[PDB]
Amino acid sequence: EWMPVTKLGRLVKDMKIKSLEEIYLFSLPIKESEIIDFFLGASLKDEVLKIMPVQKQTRAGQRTRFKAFVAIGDYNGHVGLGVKCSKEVATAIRGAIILAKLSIVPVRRGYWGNKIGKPHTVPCKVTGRCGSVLVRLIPAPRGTGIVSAPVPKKLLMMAGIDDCYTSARGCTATLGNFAKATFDAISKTYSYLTPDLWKETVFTKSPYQEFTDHLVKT
Amino acid sequence: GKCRGLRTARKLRSHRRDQKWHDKQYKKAHLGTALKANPFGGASHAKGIVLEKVGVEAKQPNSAIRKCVRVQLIKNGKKITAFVPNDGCLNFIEENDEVLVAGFGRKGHAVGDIPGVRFKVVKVANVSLLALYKGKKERPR
């Protein structure tokens, strides 16, 4: 039973907000996982990328705690990645899934050459950076598949990308930084300005302003 | 930084020539001292005569006795130590036997616990050690 605590959840639960791109358009921080469960739900699938034991030295020996990396995606242009450390593996995974849901970003897809059909590749060459790891994504011809390492390929398939060349520099053996550098590159697709997006923006009322009267009485 | 002119090809090529010699693989291949010190002389296999049976104690933390053989090479008269691979395969070799010897997997480097041994036995008296070990062939009489 979803009892929302934020005013975005109280508008999602009341059918007022009827799309995730409506929340993405205004850059509002999403703090409840039931909002993501509301819109994507049956489309979402997750993947455990690694389980990392970490240790903290104490007077009476070590202190062990386990870290979990979880990727999530709907294979249709949404992808997220979450990491969580906890004393038990089951709790770590359960808590990392929530974070992965809360990190979900949209992905922009483009065309390599001629524009027939749905977009299939990245719109342009994009680079992601994370602690000595560099990941470069290059558009690829239709039907080539994902030419990449097994770690970024999972996140690239979660995001709906079909074709892409990849390059990687730095210590990629640390998959915690290798996965956070490809996630960073995917996030940049809706940050790169192209002549497609040169039109002046029309400003629509934010949901907080549009449903003021509903929020006051609820 | 590096020079970037249109008339720089000689500088770039000469610098690359000079700096390639600081690559140890390149120097080892192209200098010629590592070819004269190679007992096989550039060959993958060689034949030799067994002089003695030796036992080499393994490097720590392992504790065992790897069973090898001392072999004198026919084509140049050099002397090497060759490891006899499988379980009990030393019982098939006898002194004054002619054996076929190969590299031991790391292009002139020692492998594993066995210290200072770069070679392994393949055949004894024109019979492969695998056939003897699996009971396909026996030593000629």
């Binding site: 050459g113 027939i116 011809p141 239709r142 039907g143 | -």
Partner: protein
């Protein structure tokens, strides 16, 4: 000096990673669905498609009215239409990149004789073809990888000299008939 020719090719390429779990499941599914013998029979069709995609990608970088683009583009498109992989109404150089291995695997004689009802399965078709029971236009063919040209689809029949056509019974029925 001899009057001999030394021209030959390899017709396949092995995968770079030998134990990729996703690729092992994907390839065995094709083997089982089309009744193939070994993994090398998937890497062959995949090599042929890879070379077709590579010629198209090279032609697509020329000018739209480049004389070589209009000559070798028409030839490739016509060749793909002739065997039945590409459609008649899709003769554009960008629709080659939409082709799949399953399209090429459907035009094998083994698949076709099964889909025409001559065989009861995809494994019965293999033995039927290899045992000299099938003919294409009065010619007996016993190569299961024979790619059926489109205007040959109608001329696949039982051989004229086989027990399943108008031929004599095989050795077994003849021998059992005299047993009594």
């Amino acid at each position: 000096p001899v009057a001999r020719s030394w021209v030959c090719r390899k017709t396949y390429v092995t995968p770079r990673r030998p134990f990729e779990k996703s690729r092992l499941d994907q390839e065995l599914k094709l083997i089982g669905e089309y009744g193939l013998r070994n993994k090398r029979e998937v890497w062959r069709v995949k090599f042929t498609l890879a070379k077709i995609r590579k010629a198209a990608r090279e032609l697509l970088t020329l000018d739209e009215k480049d004389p070589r683009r209009l000559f070798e583009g028409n030839a490739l498109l016509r060749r793909l239409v002739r065997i039945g992989v590409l459609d008649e109404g899709k003769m554009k150089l960008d629709y080659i990149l939409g082709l799949k291995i399953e399209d090429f695997l459907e035009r094998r004689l083994q698949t076709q004789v099964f889909k025409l009802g001559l065989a009861k399965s995809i494994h019965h078709a293999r033995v039927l073809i290899r045992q000299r029971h099938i003919r294409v236009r009065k010619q007996v063919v016993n190569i299961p990888s024979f790619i059926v040209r489109l205007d040959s689809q109608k001329h696949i029949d039982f051989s004229l000299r086989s027990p399943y056509g108008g031929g004599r019974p095989g050795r077994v029925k003849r021998k059992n008939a005299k047993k009594g």
